[PDB]
Structure formats: C-alpha cells, structure tokens
Symmetry: C3
Subunit: 244 residues, 3 copies
C-alpha cells in the first residue's frame, strides 16, 4: 500500500480495502475532499479531479506537480538535525505566516506538518498557522512518497474550492468519492453534511456513481437513507454507495 | 422479570430489585415518568396511576388497554418479512407523521419502535418522528408482552401530563415512584429536577411516600438532601421520602 | 512526605519529586496559586509568599498561623460521631454561610472540607458555599498536619489577590512556582496566556519561574519560551521552566 507524504487527518488508512471493494470503475475519479490523497494514491484511474477547501494544501500540491525536483531538494534542507528544536520551529512558523511566496510557503508547510504537534493543520482567528512544536525524536523526510505523488499527479487537476463546485465537474465517465469531516460522535456544518447527501442523489439520477464514508450514527443513516448502506467494523464506519 | 413490550430508554431492569427493596407499600402506585413500564409490570399494586409527557406513548397505552385483540391483530401485520427494508421503513415513518388517526398511529409506533435505530424515540424541530432505519436482522413481535401489559392495565389509568399534575393525584393510600430523565454527568431542565424534590417534600409531609431514582452526583445529593439516600453500583442513587 | 491538612484540587502528591527536580534555589518561594500548600509544605525555603484568590482559604491560613492552639482545639470538637450526618452537615453549612466571624467560619470550613462531597470547595451564584454531604465512614482530623502547617507558616505571608499581584512581589532573591487551574483536557484562556506572559517578564528580570499544567496543544503554545519537560502518569502533565 502507497503512503501519503503528509500526516493528515484520516490518511484514510484501515479502510482502503473496503473503499476499493465498493468503489465503482470509470475513467475519472473526483474527490471533493482529497486531504492526504490516499485513495488517489492507491487506485488506477486514467485521470483524477482533486479538490479541497484548504488553499495551502492545494498550492503545495500544484507545486509538487509542476516543480518536482526543485521542491524536493529545497525541502530536504529543512530535515536536518539543526532544525529539530523550538527556536528553529517557531522561527519557521513566523516565516511561513509572513511569506507571500507560494514556493517557500510550501517548503515550510511540510516541515511544520512533520515537526509540529501531532502533525495537525490549524489556524488562529487571524488566519495564521498556530500549531505548536511537536517534540519528535526524528521526523521522517518523505522522499519516496513525494516522488510517487508527483508522478501520479501528472494525471490530476487540483482545485481549491467547495465540495459543491468540485462535484459539479463530475460527468458521464466520472466516479465520485467523498470523505467529509466526520459527523459529531468555520467548522463543517450539519447543513453541509446533508447538502452533500442531496448533491449525491442528484448525481446518481444522472448515472454518476457516488461513494461517501463517515461514522455510523443516527444522522449519517438519516442523510444517506437512499444509498445502499455498508457498515464496517473496526465507533463503526459507514460506507454509503449511490449506484445507477 | 416480566418484560416491557417497548424498547424504551435504558434496558430498564438494572435496578428493579433495589427499587422493590426500598419501595414502600400501599393501595396505589403513581408513576409520573412511566416510560416503558418496568416497575408497573413487576409489582402487585391494587391500583396504578401512570403518566408521561409523551402523548404518542400514552395514547398507545390506552389503546392496548381498551382494544387489545383489535390492536394486536393490526400490529402483527406490520411484522411480516415484506416490511423489513429501508423502503418500507421510510414510507411507514412518513405515514405515521401524516396521520391523524390515533389507532393507525399506535399501530405504526410499534413498528417504528422495533425496526428503528437503537430503539430510539426522537422528534425533529418540526414535531416529526425522525429516527432512521435500524437495519435489524429479525425484530421480535412482542405479542406475549402485549397481552400481559393489557391484563395488568385493567387496574391502571393513563395520563398524558407533566409530573406536577400526576403527583397532585396521589393520596393517603398511594405511593410515588419517580424516574426523571437522568441528571447530567426542549430538554428536562435543572429547574425541573429541583422542582420534583420540592414536590416530594410536600407529599411526604402529607404522609404520602415517594422514591426517586437518579445518577449519584453533586446535584442529585443536593436536590434530594431531606430524603434517606442509598447508593448502588456509573453509580445510581435512591432517595426515599418516608413519613 | 508531608501532607496538606485540607483535601484540595491538586493536593499535588504524585508530581512532587518532579517539581523538586526542576524547581530552582533562592531565598524566597512565591506561590500565586498556593491552594493546599504541598510545595510550601515539602520544601525548605528560608521564606515564602503564599497567595490565592479564594478568601475563605487565606483567612483560614491566617487563623491557623496566628491562632494555632485556640483553632485546633475548637476544630477538633466538630470531628465527632454526632456530627457525621445530613441534619448536622446541613445545619453547619448554613451557619457557615450566615456567619460574619472569621474564626468560627474557619472552624466550620475545615469540617465542610472533610465531611463534604469529594472534598470539593464550590459556591453557587449567590456566593454561598454549596458542596453537599459526602457520607464518609469516619473523616480524619488532620491534627499533626495542622501543627506542621502552623510551625511552617512562621516563615510565610499569606495574601488574597490575583496571580498578577502576587507575582509582582517577587525580587532578585525569589523563585516562583505557578499551579494554575488546569487547561481544558472560571479561569479563562486569556488568563492562562497572561500568566505565561508575566513569566517571560520575570525571567528577563533574572527571576526564575516554574509552571505546571496538562500537556496539550495550548499549554505548549503558551509556554513556548520555556525548557519543557513532559512527565508521564489520564493525560501527561507538563512542567515549564523559565531559566535565566
Ligand atoms: N466545505 C469543504 N469543502 C471541501 N473540502 C473541505 C470542506 N471542509 C473541509 N474540507 C476538507 O475536507 C477534508 C476532510 N478530511 C476528512 C478526514 C476524516 N473523514 C476526518 O473527518 O478526520 C480536509 O482536507 C478538509 O480540509
Ligand atoms: N416534564 C415531564 N413530565 C412528565 N414526564 C416526562 C417529562 N419529561 C420527560 N418525561 C418522560 O419521562 C420519562 C423519562 N424516564 C426515563 C429516565 C431514565 N432514567 C433515563 O433518563 O434514561 C420519559 O418517558 C419521558 O417521556
Ligand atoms: N485568578 C487567580 N489568581 C490566583 N489564584 C487563583 C486564581 N484563580 C483560581 N485560583 C486558585 O488557584 C488554585 C488552583 N488549583 C490548581 C490545582 C490543579 N492544577 C487543578 O487545576 O485542579 C485554586 O486554589 C484557586 O482557588
């Protein structure tokens, strides 16, 4: 199994087998919530449409796509041992929040993801990255994963937009895989969670298959009441499939 | 222990013996929060006054009491295997939400109780029943529990009314058992929890006994201060107001 | 190890060896959040400034220091078997709340600390002490600990004031140890951070400070300028040392 180069919530890990079992075939996969990219990275579609609300994430991605070699070399230089400390971390973090250059921001963003508290991505009320120092023994530099992601990215477009807009791009030959922020056990709201079920119902009426993952709860069975449902033991996980 | 025909909050047994241990005796039992009816169905009071704010529940109970065979027969039809899919659950849920007929609604309510998600009874801001499909392999039709509930109901009256009105019906020959929505670890509010203790205090001074059960917490010991308390093992509390 | 005579939130028992490992040396110890007094009671500074916002506590501690024998003798009489019941508990609680005599308040207050639900100190919106009856088997009368506190108080001043005023009393010869109310796993987040800002001001002036708290995203954010030490023990706890 191929790994994501970023530590990122639900690098959707234990469930790849189950998603691939239910994920229907087509020319194109659309992911309105790409995140880590683990589905993207472990499937063989002829092309991908990958979107996310997080503008840093998408920008990093476009940069790993178009400037591969220059990116990897520049970023390797921050995985040295002179950087594993707080004086350097809060330093790189102040630089990231004051920079207006995409390439350098993207270099700093990968250091923060791998040297920062629990590999989190968070912002204060002014929009500044505000994850504190994560005190790790030795952060892995993800060289192999960066290369594999780049190569694989040659068949992808990356958009920074809302799930409504990326799902409007899916067509005849598309499949849609949705992995939204999890339902309760600028946040993602219950209105949006149900909105996402509606868009899916509309895409299957046009014969575009949609698959959504989420926790198994009263609200998730309510919103996905029209999909074929599949509960998966490992808080249980719910897979909802809208087949034409 | 005789079982309740409804799934209804908290698989309600884990207590019965301790309750009967402390629950004093008399002619008539008053339950302001009947819910599933476990106490009623496991005691031998000569008479019962049984009350709940939930009007779908009370209206069901009256019908099981007065139209037993007619009910059981209408309800058994909904337990055939043709009804055990998502398509039929949502159609019946919609039929119940749109119906103005107490008998048909009582029939659907048992279906929704036994085929819906975890046995819940919940409503949205529109007042509509909103529990989704439970996906159970083979739900049980509670025919024996139904008939037993009805033999016993022959000595009960059922009321749809808040705890203060039902407690006002107690007299010298009664006992009161109270099973409020639990204290914390359109909700039932802390002001209402306190108010129930105050009603118990005024009943016991009229020589009418009261037993209340709840979790054991700072607020529950506060509310129930003037009763004798027994803890049982999260921890449960029993508060007995003995004349 | 010497024990506090009150049951009190964070009667810091397991942390003590750790706090002493990292706590520097000087003439005076300043505690802005003394509470139950464990660090006071298990160190040897030649002098102490002990502070807390809770005035019943401070008044108590002043009674114990300055009226030692009159206090033990009158407190002891409440620790009998006649008094271990709800009628008596509620009678005493109401007396405490209606009383204007510091002395008798400080006597009632220990009784309530030892007979009361989980040794809690709480007040309602009226400012009346509202902890209910705790139904204990036989509550212990902390005789030795009272004498030990009093002897030890001869080298101590107690003030009832907020952390910013006590901290300001520290000089060249002082060391400050802060034990604030716990970060989320009232005292506000703004106050949590303010504390850490004052610590930074003391260290620039050559005055050491140690802080203790839960290990969390936020505590690492606030104490980002300290040598940090994680102690295992139910979340980890953080110790934050501002050294010159
Ligand atoms: N409104 C949104 N539209 C598109 N993408 C969104 C939106 N809100 C959040 N996101 C992204 O959606 C992705 C969701 N990660 C979900 C992972 C897992 N199910 C979880 O909740 O931990 C993240 O990358 C977010 O940045
Ligand atoms: N205000 C109320 N008056 C009368 N009955 C009420 C009121 N509020 C809720 N109830 C009913 O009280 C019953 C609550 N008993 C369940 C309590 C159980 N200890 C629990 O919380 O799980 C429910 O059936 C409610 O419908
Ligand atoms: N604003 C305050 N200034 C000084 N002391 C305060 C302030 N707010 C609360 N306190 C006191 O500081 C003490 C804190 N207890 C901490 C023990 C442990 N870490 C805990 O949170 O349970 C208590 O005695 C409070 O009364």
């Amino acid at each position: 199994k191929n790994r994501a180069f970023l530590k990122w919530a639900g690098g959707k890990y234990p469930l790849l087998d189950d998603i691939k079992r239910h994920l229907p075939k087509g020319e194109c996969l659309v992911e309105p919530f790409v995140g880590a990219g683990s589905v993207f990275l472990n499937t063989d579609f002829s092309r991908y449409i990958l979107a996310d609300i997080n503008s840093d994430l998408i920008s990093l991605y476009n940069i790993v796509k178009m400037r591969t070699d220059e990116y990897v070399q520049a970023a390797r230089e921050l995985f040295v041992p002179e950087t594993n400390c707080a004086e350097v971390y809060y330093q790189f973090r102040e630089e990231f929040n004051k920079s207006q250059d995409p390439f350098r921001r993207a270099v700093l963003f990968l250091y923060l993801n791998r040297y920062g508290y629990n590999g989190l991505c968070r912002y204060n009320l002014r929009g500044e990255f505000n994850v504190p120092f994560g005190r790790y023994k030795k952060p892995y530099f993800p060289e192999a994963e960066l290369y594999h992601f780049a190569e694989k990215a040659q068949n992808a477009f990356f958009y920074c937009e809302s799930y409504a807009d990326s799902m409007a791009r899916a067509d005849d030959a598309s499949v849609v895989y949705c992995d939204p922020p999890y339902a309760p056990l600028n946040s993602f709201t219950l209105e949006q969670q149900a909105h996402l079920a509606e868009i899916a119902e509309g895409l299957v009426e046009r014969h575009i298959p949609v698959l959504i993952s989420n926790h198994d709860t009263m609200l998730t069975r309510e919103w996905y009441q029209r999909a074929k449902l599949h509960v998966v033991k490992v808080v249980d996980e719910l897979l909802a499939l809208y087949k034409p």
